[PDB]
Write a protein that binds this ligand. Sequence first.
Ligand SMILES: [Mg+2]
Ligand SMILES: [Mg+2]
Ligand SMILES: [Mg+2]
Ligand SMILES: [Mg+2]
Ligand SMILES: [Mg+2]
Ligand SMILES: [Mg+2]
Ligand SMILES: [Mg+2]
Ligand SMILES: [Mg+2]
Ligand SMILES: [Mg+2]
Ligand SMILES: [Mg+2]
Ligand SMILES: [Mg+2]
Ligand SMILES: [Mg+2]
Ligand SMILES: [Mg+2]
Ligand SMILES: [Mg+2]
Ligand SMILES: [Mg+2]
Ligand SMILES: [Mg+2]
Ligand SMILES: [Mg+2]
Ligand SMILES: [Mg+2]
Ligand SMILES: [Mg+2]
Ligand SMILES: [Mg+2]
Ligand SMILES: [Mg+2]
Lengths: 63, 67, 60, 80, 206, 55, 70, 141, 143, 145
Amino acid sequence: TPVTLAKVIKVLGRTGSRGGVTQVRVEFLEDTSRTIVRNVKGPVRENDILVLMESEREARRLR
Amino acid sequence: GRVRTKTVKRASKALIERYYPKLTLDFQTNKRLCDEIATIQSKRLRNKIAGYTTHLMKRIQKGPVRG
Amino acid sequence: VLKISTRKTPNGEGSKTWETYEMRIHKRYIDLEAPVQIVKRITQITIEPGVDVEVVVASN
Amino acid sequence: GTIVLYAERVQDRGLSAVAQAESMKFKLLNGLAIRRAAYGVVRYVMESGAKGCEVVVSGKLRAARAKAMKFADGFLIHSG
Amino acid sequence: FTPVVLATPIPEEVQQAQTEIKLFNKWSFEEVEVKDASLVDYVQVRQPIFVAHTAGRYANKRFRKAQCPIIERLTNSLMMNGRNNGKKLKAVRIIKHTLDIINVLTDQNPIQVVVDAITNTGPREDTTRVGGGGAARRQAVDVSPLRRVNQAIALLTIGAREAAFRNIKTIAETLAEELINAAKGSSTSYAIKKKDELERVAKSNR
Amino acid sequence: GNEGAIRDKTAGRRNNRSKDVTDSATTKKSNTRRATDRHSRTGKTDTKKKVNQGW
Amino acid sequence: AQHAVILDQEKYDRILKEVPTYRYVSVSVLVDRLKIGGSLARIALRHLEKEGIIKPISKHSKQAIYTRAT
Amino acid sequence: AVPSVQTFGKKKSATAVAHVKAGKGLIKVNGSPITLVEPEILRFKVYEPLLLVGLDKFSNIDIRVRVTGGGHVSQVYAIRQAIAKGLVAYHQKYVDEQSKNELKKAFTSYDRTLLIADSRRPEPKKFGGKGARSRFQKSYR
Amino acid sequence: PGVSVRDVAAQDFINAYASFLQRQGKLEVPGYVDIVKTSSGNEMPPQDAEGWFYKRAASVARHIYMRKQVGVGKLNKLYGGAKSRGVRPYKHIDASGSINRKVLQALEKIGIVEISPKGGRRISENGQRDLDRIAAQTLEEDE
Amino acid sequence: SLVVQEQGSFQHILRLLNTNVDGNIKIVYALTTIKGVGRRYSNLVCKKADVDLHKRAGELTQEELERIVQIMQNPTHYKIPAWFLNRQNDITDGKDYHTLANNVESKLRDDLERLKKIRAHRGIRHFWGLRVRGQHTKTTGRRRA
RNA sequence: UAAUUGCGAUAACGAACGAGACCUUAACCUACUAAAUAGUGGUGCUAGCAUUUGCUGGUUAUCCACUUCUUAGAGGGACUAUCGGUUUCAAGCCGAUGGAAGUUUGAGGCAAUAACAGGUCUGUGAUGCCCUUAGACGUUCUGGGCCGCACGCGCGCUACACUGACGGAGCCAGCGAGUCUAACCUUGGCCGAGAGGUCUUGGUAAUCUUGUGAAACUCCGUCGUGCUGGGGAUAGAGCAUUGUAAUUAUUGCUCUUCAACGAGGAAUUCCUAGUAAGCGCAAGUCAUCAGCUUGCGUUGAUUACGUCCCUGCCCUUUGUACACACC
Ligand SMILES: [Mg+2]
Ligand SMILES: [Mg+2]
Ligand SMILES: [Mg+2]
Ligand SMILES: [Mg+2]
Ligand SMILES: [Mg+2]
Ligand SMILES: [Mg+2]
Ligand SMILES: [Mg+2]
Ligand SMILES: [Mg+2]
Ligand SMILES: [Mg+2]
Ligand SMILES: [Mg+2]
Ligand SMILES: [Mg+2]
Ligand SMILES: [Mg+2]
Ligand SMILES: [Mg+2]
Ligand SMILES: [Mg+2]
Ligand SMILES: [Mg+2]
Ligand SMILES: [Mg+2]
Ligand SMILES: [Mg+2]
Ligand SMILES: [Mg+2]
Ligand SMILES: [Mg+2]
Ligand SMILES: [Mg+2]
Ligand SMILES: [Mg+2]
């Protein structure tokens, strides 16, 4: 099973009608240079570390 | 929220307007200044004021302020 | 502090708003060692609408 | 002898709520026009050096359905 | 350890372990580490404590909740289901007890097995109901470290509580048991099943 | 009297249990009017002369 | 009504030979050896302490903890 | 007399007064030795300052505490406060500063509000519910 | 060093003192003990049966040693607890004024407590004596 | 306390007072399955019979058991107050009894009937299968009979 | 921004009501003025254990001194301060340090203009008109009734146990209240299993009840998963209290009798920190009766620090033949 480590950078905001969801851009630590935006379920600030279970499929707006 | 009502902001204006020599970047003395230099009816309203008239003061130093 | 806690309504209708009146009682005492004269001089005058003065004597 | 009564006129009735209420009562019982009654009561209190005054008349006059009126002049404050 | 005694005497082992190391009930904070990346920061351990009771203001600000010593975080979460609401003294004792049991079994800093089980039972990603139009499908997300710690605590505790319910075995054992099994997950713990079944469904929608 | 009360068949729990329950026992509030609150029913009316003398 | 509440001789023996390899020995443990009920198990704990196999690592009511002697 | 200071500790309601005079290392709470002080699960909450700042230190002093009010927890958190405050007051007048600041540095660096009392307090309930925030159940119909 | 009972934890003191009075024989036990209940806020009698009257008296002693004067009223309340009013909310309830008042009469006959001025019962001068003894005994149990 | 042994000396289930009693239950509580005897009564009767309460029902020597029953039906000779007794002042011979076992069934009946047979309101209320001690019967108790 | 709270934009400029201010309460003062109705240290008089000085108690004035703790007067304190991020470098917002305190400091009191056929003539010797007024719808006296029970709805209490029940043991609050022409709050001593009784007693009260020794909770035991010792409905028999009166059982005690309930369908309530929840207390009512309420302290969390999806409201825009205003 591949694992993937990404450092959160810059809180972009809340999506999801309810609002519990939070869009953030992250940076990989296993070779940086590339960043990707993710949707989160819990509370998040800058410099957190997210286990991307699959390192390549970013999302956008939630309903 | 901590938005100062007009009465505080109004009064700070009036005081910086005509006591810029005297007055300081220091609240503590701006406080005491307010006593001699203006009647106010409550200790709370005075610091509320003097704190803000210090704020306005502290950033006139770094350029003008409209009003 | 004498509290009285009551419904505002004369009747029953409405959300049940409760309201507590209060009356504060302040009591002092000053102990004096003085002759018969000053005592009465000090009791009769120094009076005031609102303050209840009580003078007791006694060893006990 | 343990009880003693002393009457004593008041300094300017024109700043005594109770004074002016009872005046209207009386005014209105000699049947002055509603507004004439109250409007003078305002304009005397004012004269007696008040910083604001205000009168309400609620209830029923001549018509069947109940009404109410504000009569006010000068400055009031209402809170705290 | 340079002995010292005054008027009202202070107990041997008490002088002995305290003044030296600042360790737990009588367990070691040092060594103990968060074996998964992240979770560091969002799991305490150091500063070290004696027992897990504290008048801690971990509430009045958003994230400071993180700073609470994770052993005592665990304990707080032990004291619920209305009948046990409050009752920290009751709880704390279970942990002291629990940690002893965890210890007896498979050696190891018991305070570290706690660390393993927590790290090991929080969902790395999850689902959330999305508008989509009435028939609201399931959109996947990656979950916060904080959220991931919290769920681990709550999951761990619950599974034991329900194990403890209606049976001879005590809170402390089932809690110890739940943990020990959750150290490196073993499909028999209420939490791992729930983690795994949660990531089953999370991966079931992307 | 009391003699009758116990001797009286047609009474006591068994008997009520063995009876169906009225439907009036599960009604609503009944309301009956409230939708006419602002429409005065006196059938009078005041009038601008009599109001103007009053006020 | 489902067996636990006594001392059946062949049981006592089992409570002597079966207890080694018990890495953990508590109240719950003893009932779980398809045998004694809590009461005449709590008595066992103090009596295996008479001499051997169990060291008292933890104390009190509700919770007991013993391990294999060394 | 002898060199001494008096200090206090307050948590919730509980007020723990302490007398810290010069003596031979005595520490008794309410009349009994500190090695008792049950609840006891929390015992180390009150052993805590001693260990924090070196088991010695108390050799030139005595300590008594008197806790009234509060309850079976708020008194423990209160007495420890008065104990460690007590020790710092003593150096403040009798020993020296750098030795005072030494102590206050470890009491702070650890802290469970050991020198400074906790501000928290009950909030008054208000009519309509059994709690300060809680409102009674309602029904619409 | 020298020793006061205050220098011993409750369950270490009283259980040593309770054992003392039982090991001794001078006491006065009521007789209704074994059929009585300790309080109307209770459900079953004491399980110590042969005993427990020693244990209260031992506790009663130590309490009255720890203070100026106290009487039945206070001890009734001290030993009172919750009474399950069945389906209704609990309230505190006072315990039995007999078991206590008779313990007071007992401990006094054996000279560990005396009637007191200002009211109540004061710790005896021979109570001090004999209590600080066994205190110094179970401190010696950890010698 | 003790680790005991016993030969085949203890039997499971044993029958006294026309009812059955489980063997491996502590003898105080074991006794309660008998109608009319509750925990307080059981407890005292045993203390009086000089039995070791630590024991289960089955252990008890047949002598000890026989003794026990004997006190249960003559509580007042064998020194047990009276305020311990379910039927003080027998409203006819006015003695003080402790109705037991099968008898408590019959003496409930006898009482219920004395009321009914005298037409007293309580009786009537019993015959109507209602609540008697004056409880609102609007809301509570509806499944029931 | 909690706020028509401000910044800013600007045919507007500059103000007042309401918001804020204000007031009350809870937090900080070893700074000020004091206290035998609050308390500390010393000293006598004195008990106990040690003795080497010690340790732990007793003593409404045997004396001296103080005000830390308690009390309440006068002041002081905080102004989101300093610093740093972010922002139209604007009002602001966020983070760190410090601080008794930095969510409007926390919680309240006050509260403009206007609306409703809201509720109250059953609070009033407030009141119009109507009805009735001696075989009364006046009033009082005797007895019953508001409690009645196939059943539907709402608020509640207690539980379905082992984070427990039971038994012994530890043993800690705060807000309160109490008797004059009177029988209120009750200590202590006896008697009683208990409820209670009896004899005295302190208090018009920071003085006495009362340290309200409260309950959860803490400890050592017993029971061991069995409707069990969880649970305590229903019911019999006896004692006692309030009251002129207790039957349709006022309440309290005792033995016995030992139900439903094995965590609850669709639905739905409340809540963000000393808060939720658990726990008891005082006060109102009150002769007697709290499963209710108003407050109070004790133990003390999990989870947000978001959004407009549901629901409710407010705002512009927009339509009107409505203005008694969609009833
Ligand atoms: Mg204003
Ligand atoms: Mg205001
Ligand atoms: Mg409960
Ligand atoms: Mg108690
Ligand atoms: Mg008790
Ligand atoms: Mg029975
Ligand atoms: Mg009823
Ligand atoms: Mg002071
Ligand atoms: Mg800080
Ligand atoms: Mg209407
Ligand atoms: Mg009215
Ligand atoms: Mg009614
Ligand atoms: Mg309601
Ligand atoms: Mg208990
Ligand atoms: Mg008798
Ligand atoms: Mg008198
Ligand atoms: Mg049962
Ligand atoms: Mg029960
Ligand atoms: Mg009451
Ligand atoms: Mg009511
Ligand atoms: Mg238009």
